[PDB]
Amino acid sequence: KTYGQSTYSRQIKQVEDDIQQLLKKINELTGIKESDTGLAPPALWDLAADKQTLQSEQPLQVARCTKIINADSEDPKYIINVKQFAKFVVDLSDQVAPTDIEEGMRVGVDRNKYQIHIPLPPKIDPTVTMMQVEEKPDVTYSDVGGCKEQIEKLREVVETPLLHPERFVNLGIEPPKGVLLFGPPGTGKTLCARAVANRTDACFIRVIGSELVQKYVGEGARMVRELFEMARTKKACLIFFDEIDAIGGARFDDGAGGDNEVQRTMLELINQLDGFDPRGNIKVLMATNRPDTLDPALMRPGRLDRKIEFSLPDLEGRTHIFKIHARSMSVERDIRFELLARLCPNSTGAEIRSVCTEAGMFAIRARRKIATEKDFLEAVNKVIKSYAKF
Amino acid sequence: ASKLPLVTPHTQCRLKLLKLERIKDYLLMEEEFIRNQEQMKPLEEKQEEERSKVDDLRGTPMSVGTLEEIIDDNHAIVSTSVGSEHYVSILSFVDKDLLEPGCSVLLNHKVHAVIGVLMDDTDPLVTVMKVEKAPQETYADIGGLDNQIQEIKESVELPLTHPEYYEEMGIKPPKGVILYGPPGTGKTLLAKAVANQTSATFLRVVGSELIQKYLGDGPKLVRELFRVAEEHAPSIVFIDEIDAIGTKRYDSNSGGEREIQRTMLELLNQLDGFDSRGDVKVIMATNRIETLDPALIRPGRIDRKIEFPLPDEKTKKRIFQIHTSRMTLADDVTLDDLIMAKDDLSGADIKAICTEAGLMALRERRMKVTNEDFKKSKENVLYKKQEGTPEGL
Amino acid sequence: KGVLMYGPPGTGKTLLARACAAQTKATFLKLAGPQLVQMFIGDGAKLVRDAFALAKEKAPSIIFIDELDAIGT
Amino acid sequence: SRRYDSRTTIFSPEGRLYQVEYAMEAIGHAGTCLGILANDGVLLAAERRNIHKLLDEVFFSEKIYKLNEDMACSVAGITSDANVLTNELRLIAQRYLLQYQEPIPCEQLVTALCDIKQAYTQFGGKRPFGVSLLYIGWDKHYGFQLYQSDPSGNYGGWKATCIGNNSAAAVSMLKQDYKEGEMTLKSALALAIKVLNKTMDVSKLSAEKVEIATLTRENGKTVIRVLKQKEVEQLIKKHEEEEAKAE
Amino acid sequence: LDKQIKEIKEVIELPVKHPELFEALGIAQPKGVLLYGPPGTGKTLLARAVAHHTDCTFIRVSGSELVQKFIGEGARMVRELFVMAREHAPSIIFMDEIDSI
Amino acid sequence: GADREVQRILLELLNQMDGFDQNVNVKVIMATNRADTLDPALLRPGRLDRKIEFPLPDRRQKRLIFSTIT
Numbered sequence A: 001k002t003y004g005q006s007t008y009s010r011q012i013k014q015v016e017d018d019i020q021q022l023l024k025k026i027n028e029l030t031g032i033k034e035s036d037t038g039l040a041p042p043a044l045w046d047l048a049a050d051k052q053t054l055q056s057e058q059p060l061q062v063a064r065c066t067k068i069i070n071a072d073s074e075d076p077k078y079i080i081n082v083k084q085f086a087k088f089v090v091d092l093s094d095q096v097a098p099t100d101i102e103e104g105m106r107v108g109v110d111r112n113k114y115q116i117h118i119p120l121p122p123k124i125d126p127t128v129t130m131m132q133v134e135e136k137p138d139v140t141y142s143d144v145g146g147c148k149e150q151i152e153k154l155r156e157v158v159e160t161p162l163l164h165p166e167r168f169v170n171l172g173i174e175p176p177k178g179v180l181l182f183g184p185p186g187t188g189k190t191l192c193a194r195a196v197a198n199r200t201d202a203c204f205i206r207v208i209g210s211e212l213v214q215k216y217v218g219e220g221a222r223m224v225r226e227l228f229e230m231a232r233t234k235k236a237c238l239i240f241f242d243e244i245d246a247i248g249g250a251r252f253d254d255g256a257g258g259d260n261e262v263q264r265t266m267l268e269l270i271n272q273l274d275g276f277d278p279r280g281n282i283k284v285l286m287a288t289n290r291p292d293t294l295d296p297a298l299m300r301p302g303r304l305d306r307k308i309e310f311s312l313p314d315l316e317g318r319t320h321i322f323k324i325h326a327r328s329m330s331v332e333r334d335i336r337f338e339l340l341a342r343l344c345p346n347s348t349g350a351e352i353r354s355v356c357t358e359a360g361m362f363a364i365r366a367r368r369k370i371a372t373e374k375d376f377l378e379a380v381n382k383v384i385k386s387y388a389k390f
Numbered sequence B: 001a002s003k004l005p006l007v008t009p010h011t012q013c014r015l016k017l018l019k020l021e022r023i024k025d026y027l028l029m030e031e032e033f034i035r036n037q038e039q040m041k042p043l044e045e046k047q048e049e050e051r052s053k054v055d056d057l058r059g060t061p062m063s064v065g066t067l068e069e070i071i072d073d074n075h076a077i078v079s080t081s082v083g084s085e086h087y088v089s090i091l092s093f094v095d096k097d098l099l100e101p102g103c104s105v106l107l108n109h110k111v112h113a114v115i116g117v118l119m120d121d122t123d124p125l126v127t128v129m130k131v132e133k134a135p136q137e138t139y140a141d142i143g144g145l146d147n148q149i150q151e152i153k154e155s156v157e158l159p160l161t162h163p164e165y166y167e168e169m170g171i172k173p174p175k176g177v178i179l180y181g182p183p184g185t186g187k188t189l190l191a192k193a194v195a196n197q198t199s200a201t202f203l204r205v206v207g208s209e210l211i212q213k214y215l216g217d218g219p220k221l222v223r224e225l226f227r228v229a230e231e232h233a234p235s236i237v238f239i240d241e242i243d244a245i246g247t248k249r250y251d252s253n254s255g256g257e258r259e260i261q262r263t264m265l266e267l268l269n270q271l272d273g274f275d276s277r278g279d280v281k282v283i284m285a286t287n288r289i290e291t292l293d294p295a296l297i298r299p300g301r302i303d304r305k306i307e308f309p310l311p312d313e314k315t316k317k318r319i320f321q322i323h324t325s326r327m328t329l330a331d332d333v334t335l336d337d338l339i340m341a342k343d344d345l346s347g348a349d350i351k352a353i354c355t356e357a358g359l360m361a362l363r364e365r366r367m368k369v370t371n372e373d374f375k376k377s378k379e380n381v382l383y384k385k386q387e388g389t390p391e392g393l
Numbered sequence C: 001k002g003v004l005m006y007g008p009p010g011t012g013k014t015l016l017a018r019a020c021a022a023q024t025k026a027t028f029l030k031l032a033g034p035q036l037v038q039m040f041i042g043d044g045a046k047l048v049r050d051a052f053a054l055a056k057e058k059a060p061s062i063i064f065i066d067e068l069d070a071i072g073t
Numbered sequence D: 001s002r003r004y005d006s007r008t009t010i011f012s013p014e015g016r017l018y019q020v021e022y023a024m025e026a027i028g029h030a031g032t033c034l035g036i037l038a039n040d041g042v043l044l045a046a047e048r049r050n051i052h053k054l055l056d057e058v059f060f061s062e063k064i065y066k067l068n069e070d071m072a073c074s075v076a077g078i079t080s081d082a083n084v085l086t087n088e089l090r091l092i093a094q095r096y097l098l099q100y101q102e103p104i105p106c107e108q109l110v111t112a113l114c115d116i117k118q119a120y121t122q123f124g125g126k127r128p129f130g131v132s133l134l135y136i137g138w139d140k141h142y143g144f145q146l147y148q149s150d151p152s153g154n155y156g157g158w159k160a161t162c163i164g165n166n167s168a169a170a171v172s173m174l175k176q177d178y179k180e181g182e183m184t185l186k187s188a189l190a191l192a193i194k195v196l197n198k199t200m201d202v203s204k205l206s207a208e209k210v211e212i213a214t215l216t217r218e219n220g221k222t223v224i225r226v227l228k229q230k231e232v233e234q235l236i237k238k239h240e241e242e243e244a245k246a247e
Numbered sequence E: 001l002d003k004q005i006k007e008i009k010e011v012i013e014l015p016v017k018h019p020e021l022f023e024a025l026g027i028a029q030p031k032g033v034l035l036y037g038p039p040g041t042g043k044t045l046l047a048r049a050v051a052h053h054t055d056c057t058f059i060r061v062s063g064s065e066l067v068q069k070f071i072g073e074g075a076r077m078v079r080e081l082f083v084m085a086r087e088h089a090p091s092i093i094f095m096d097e098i099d100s101i
Numbered sequence F: 001g002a003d004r005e006v007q008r009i010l011l012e013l014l015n016q017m018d019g020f021d022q023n024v025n026v027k028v029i030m031a032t033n034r035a036d037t038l039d040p041a042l043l044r045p046g047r048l049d050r051k052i053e054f055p056l057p058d059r060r061q062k063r064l065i066f067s068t069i070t
């Protein structure tokens, strides 16, 4: 056997093993043989063997998707274009009211007289619907420390104006609508963005700059245009471009053509942001390690109105970060976290989290279950000093 | 099988024992009652004939369409093969866990209502990147590292073996390990070993294999590579010869280097970005590391960084006896005489010496390999050094 | 025939055109250089030709091609 | 102007002078050169590259150069930089002679030239000289001598060397078949013929695709000579005969 | 072709004529060879010479030809080629234009 | 796809050319301004077996063509 992990190890192992056996036994005693035809658990062929399927197949006919192209005369008469089938001039069934149908919206029509019965949501590139956040992160504004003025500005530009419009509307200030976050790698940009996404109360979209380069000409611009149309359907949304330097490259066309399609997509984003077509309720963020490369047209107010500098944290912020990350630990009681803050010279958040984890490591390798000071000193050594030359 | 989570301390304890004993006892009551019912009545006939009703509802000429958007409410837009787009009703017997956009759905012929789904191929890229067992050898064939292998084991293997250790204290494992050192020193081999020894799906890629000749293909490749790694449970990725893709990132450059930088940004986001990386680890190798980008090898992206020195005096003996292991040698083999020289030999150099000696032994028909052959082979292999002798010294 | 506005970024270009649309009454059409580039060969030209056709058919009108530098290289 | 500057005299990020490395890379393609110091002579054996039926015969040689009455040198690299360096060497020899009325010792000279070359690769912004030298001579300090130089400015005394094409192979045999202190001039010439026959893999010694030099002391004074056609061909016939008897 | 003939001898006739030396010496038997160079340099002539001298069959295919129309025709051709080479114990395959694939 | 369909036409041409018995008097002649850009699969024996240069005229041909056209 082994050294002995815990007194109950064997007892829990036994209860798990017989749990597995009883689960297998019920599996055999209930059937549930995997079916290659995608068919539900027999206890879930429910309303399915009968009584809803047989009641849904009778009244619910098959409508066919069609894309309205024109709505001529006040009298209902609709030209729809069924995909790869035909193109017709049809009328409205009674269920839909005339106001519901507009030009350009997908509609459903029946298979006999092709009259309109239901609208439908527009078609969005599968690669442009996933950038919605769906499940929001849990990081919050207590997890970001040593950046207090920066977070204040970000919160006053992306967050406060949506929650309390009347403050700004009364005095008559249209709040800035863009932020450029720039600072050394690993200083707190993406984390503050995560926090903003968690706290905010409106649609959030994550776009990577490297996600807008495409093989076929004139696709990236379409992607940007669709993204902004989608974001404009919502009531209010935030878009957070990462590594925007990916496609905001400076314009240097000369001689043989080089990186020109990226330039067209960049111009399309520029025109979407601030341009003839009004930008509705949208707020934009960008993060870059290298803000200089961004072109003169993007970095201009009206598109990126604010510029927040993230600098390496000061000593107070250093200890604060140490303490935030050393929270869910099984750690000793008294650690002079000021000592640890001093002992690491200018170092970023990533340094500090690495310090915490390396201290946990040096605790484990010593077969200890509570982290002490010596663990943290060893951690700081192994992190700062040893990995200096990189 | 969709069992309850104990969510006691999760570490061996009395509460984990009582929440565990309770589920066991309920399963016991259920099993007893079920066995009683089965003895009292088979129900085989009743469970049957439900298949018959289902197959009655789904007519014989079932049609394979292609789902394209689920309205979230037991409805769908299913596209027939030609290209038409219908708006059908999802019935009650389709296992909805298997319904996602792009799935080959099985529709009714007259009514196209969704009545099933089908499996798909498993090789978008899974086959081409997964390496299976390493043909070279297991941890046995590697010697002299000891400390490095220990680091890797703790970084990538130990968090899979016994999560309790890390979990007990509230610290997550390191994120990624970058293997750096002089060429021919045991990086790729150690990755191969920790691959063939662990229990996850290990994927390997060459950096020059991410340099694509159509725009926006490198970023797609990296995005996919990190896309079929969460589909597959715990997973490991090893991007070898990364130097060819991650470089200092000098801005005064023209050509396809911009695409290189753009794929580097995609990777830099995948490793640590907006979303949570799930359960995956990232190993990397680079013979030349001083030239990587600070944001790629920064702490939260790659916590562990491993140096790989050359064999010094004795690891040379170990490697030599490892590669000479399978060959009949004459009883005059002065191996130390070959090792004692401080010729800065590398591991791959040792393999080259072994193979060349074996090959000339084959050339001369001789049933055994002689020391003179090994020394001649050593001279021949070292002959591939060159350079300007007085210069620089 | 035609008017082109050139000046450094943010020097007041699109705002004047927006104002002209605000005061003028003929049919306005907006656009963007990158909007006429399509993947399919022969689609950008069809876009342009149909746009001029609609402008012509719907009484006198103006077309505003912003970011003309996208296609005029 | 900094835009067009090449920076031919600046360190690389690992402390290696690149222009120097490329200069030494040029030499590895010119004619091979051989050094062999006997106990009673010194000898230079380079390959005659100017192998065309329409070239004319001029001068006492084509690659060997006299520098004093008691010193000669052969060149591998660029021909024009060769001429420049030869002229400066001649000037150095005469300047020493004028100051001291004694022939310039051999390491006196070789280090003067290499100092010029090194200085040239240290500051100035020029390209370095792409030439590597082999020398031969006698002086009352060390007797018969055989030195060598490189674009860097480093030199070295060699009992036997090879600078130029197929240098590795030539030095490999020279290591295998050199008797330190047990070599007559005749044996050294035969060893040269053999090694060169290997190296000049293109055909065999045609007695015309080769150059040989001998420096000896005769009647108390140095005598320098360039082997004629008859003796060279006779030596080659002797070499083939010896190899045939050996097989 | 003395140089290439001797080389191919030493690289193939050994695994076929004398498939013992490798067993004893423990050095794994080479599984194939690659021929490269400009066009028309006797590659097929040497392949045929070795196939005849080694008393083995010379199933031959061209990589260009391998790139046929039917989907999987390359895969099916490879499977058929190897199964037939297995039916003929003594065999040597000569994929001609492997570069094209 | 488009390139796939062109490759399909090309392969169909090769398959039809190879489908002869040397006993049917159906001959094929094709003209190209760039032979080098053709795929080699056409040039292989059994298919197209003659290439006929049509070089720019030399003196004698220039004289003959002048006389015949004047």
Ligand SMILES: Nc1ncnc2c1ncn2[C@@H]1O[C@H](COP(=O)(O)OP(=O)(O)OP(=O)(O)O)[C@@H](O)[C@H]1O
Pocket: A143, A144, A145, A146, A147, A183, A184, A185, A186, A187, A188, A189, A190, A191, A192, A287, A288, A289, A321, A324, A348, A349, A350, A353, B272, B295, B300
């Ligand atoms: N002020 C901070 N408080 C807490 N954690 C921090 C702080 N700054 C950085 N970190 C840690 O740094 C890790 C690195 O991610 P982060 O979002 O900070 O990177 P970043 O600054 O956006 O970097 P990049 O420039 O590479 O995009 C975060 O997971 C967080 O753990």
Ligand SMILES: Nc1ncnc2c1ncn2[C@@H]1O[C@H](COP(=O)(O)OP(=O)(O)OP(=O)(O)O)[C@@H](O)[C@H]1O
Pocket: B141, B142, B143, B144, B145, B182, B183, B184, B185, B186, B187, B188, B189, B190, B285, B286, B287, B319, B322, B346, B347, B348, B351
């Ligand atoms: N300590 C060692 N034990 C066993 N084999 C070794 C050792 N060191 C080197 N080798 C040999 O080195 C060969 C080269 O493969 P390896 O995976 O070590 O390369 P690498 O160090 O990753 O090289 P590169 O830097 O070019 O990527 C392996 O086949 C193995 O035989």
Ligand SMILES: Nc1ncnc2c1ncn2[C@@H]1O[C@H](COP(=O)(O)OP(=O)(O)OP(=O)(O)O)[C@@H](O)[C@H]1O
Pocket: A274, A275, A297, A302, C008, C009, C010, C011, C012, C013, C014, C015, C016
């Ligand atoms: N002379 C001006 N009078 C009034 N507003 C001005 C003037 N110059 C610039 N602006 C302001 O500039 C802001 C942005 O400029 P705008 O986009 O209209 O200019 P542009 O030259 O068309 O820019 P771009 O090159 O980005 O298309 C507008 O909100 C407008 O208020």
Ligand SMILES: [Mg+2]
Pocket: B182, B183, B184, B185, B186, B187, B188, B287
């Ligand atoms: Mg390596």
Ligand SMILES: [Mg+2]
Pocket: A275, A276, C013, C014, C066, C067
């Ligand atoms: Mg504008």
